[model samples]
Target: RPACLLVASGAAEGVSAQSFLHCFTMASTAFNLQVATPGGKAMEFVDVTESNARWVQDFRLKAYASPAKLESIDGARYHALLIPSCPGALTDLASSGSLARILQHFHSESKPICAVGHGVAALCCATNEDRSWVFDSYSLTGPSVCLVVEDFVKDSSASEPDAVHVVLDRHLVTGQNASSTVPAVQNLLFLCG
Candidate 1:
């Protein structure tokens, strides 16, 4: 079975990066699970500011999984939630609804979720804990708002105009910065196992 779910963001901070080579090199390569890339453009890297929600909205779910027969995981056979961290991607993934629905399905199966970089942002967006449903079980130590704002103060690349949030729960695992990829993956995998 796949070791853990990988929440990847298309945002430069989210995926398609070299800084997080550890994940791609050891963890991800060993996990043998699904890699859900928000389709199209997204946060290309950590330092970047542009957010591409278009990718999540355009995620090729129908192409990757059986669109009609996608089943809620009923056992340990399936585990993980891979989400990208682009605020735009997070917003779009939430707006698109499919990602959240999938998450809910996974949650019902009691599988642990792992997200890094903007992917953590995307998960927080999906839950909308403050406004919609509550995510009482989540815990977090990801990139603080101060860090993001401070970084933006020096160099900004965000496409979205709203503030970012990082809501989490008991089974949720968040990595503070893009650099936390490997550790995040390893930690989540260990926790889930």
Candidate 2:
């Protein structure tokens, strides 16, 4: 089985519950799932959100599995990388020096990388000299959860104004919204194997 590293937002700030569940569950079908967080407890009951409902309480009741410390993890140990979107990515994961280096490794090796919704902003962690983005020239899309991420994609290359579920470019797979998580994770694990 392929080993997939799941990079989470970590903070109690709400991550799309739909996105996290689908990505983790589906990827588990083929990939050995491991978790990584930016800070705080390695395992904590994280905050989650959903549209048109108030049932997010279930996640609050479950303690998550212990995550590999982001500061010490070697990105190359895994065959693929998974990033689940949230505002915490912008506040935490996106700014981590470790995550930035990890992204550089993933990009340099052409390893499969999957990111969804606001998770796309974590891509901003990696940069070239003068702060050019690592994923430059790639056609990608994501939800409007973060304006900076949209501008990142827009400034780097052509981006679809409206994403139709999942967008795949070589080994990179992105889902613009939580609704796209099904196919997005499927496509990502496909490349991992």
Candidate 3:
């Protein structure tokens, strides 16, 4: 019964991110249950969105679940992480000062980490300042999505190109853009399995 922690920005401002969450929820509950894996394992999730209580999503009130406290991660038996597609949201989460520490724990444990769209950008700030990127091969697909890593790498004079559609580098799974959420989740499930 391995669970997954779903960390998102309380801002929830991006439409693609909202769509990604919806699709993920649909996929996770296709069997009418919270655990989404094929083995009938309990894949629970706790949203880390309590800090910014004033935030809101477009065309919705308190989109997603009422966020649980950050400390909740410590008690949950989670092995994987699911980040939705929202550049600003991801950035905010990274800048929170606690996210990197939390992600580091999961990374060190060799757990599966998956993100769609610019949500992958958070990984850049979720590392030890060295060995930060989850993959040598990454992608943004079309111009619709932009990863903050692109600029971060560019500023550091590093030459790296984004991959196509979805990129799976071991336990780090990422989708090129919002459209690739389905395959991204599928790939994540495969990796987790």
Best by lDDT: 2
lDDT of 1 by residue, 45-154 (tens): 44322343333334433353211121223224456654433443444443434456666666666566766554454444334444443233445544434221232223
Model 3 C-alpha lDDT per residue in residues 51-98, reported as the tens digit of each score = 322332421352333445543345135667776665554445545445
Model 2 per-residue lDDT tens digits across residues 1-193: 8688988877656366667777777777787788788754432223443551353345344454556788888888999998875656777776788899998999999999999877877888787777888888777767653433455655662245444478899888988866667777888867765
Give candidate 2 misplaced runs (Cα > 4 Å): 40-64, 145-153, 157-164
**TM-scores for all candidates?**
0.56, 0.82, 0.63
Runs with alpha carbons beyond 4 Å of true place in candidate 3: 12-18, 30-64, 129-164
C-alpha RMSD of each candidate structure in angstroms? 9.5, 3.6, 9.2
Error of 2 at 64 (Å): 5.8
Clashing pairs in 2: 85-119
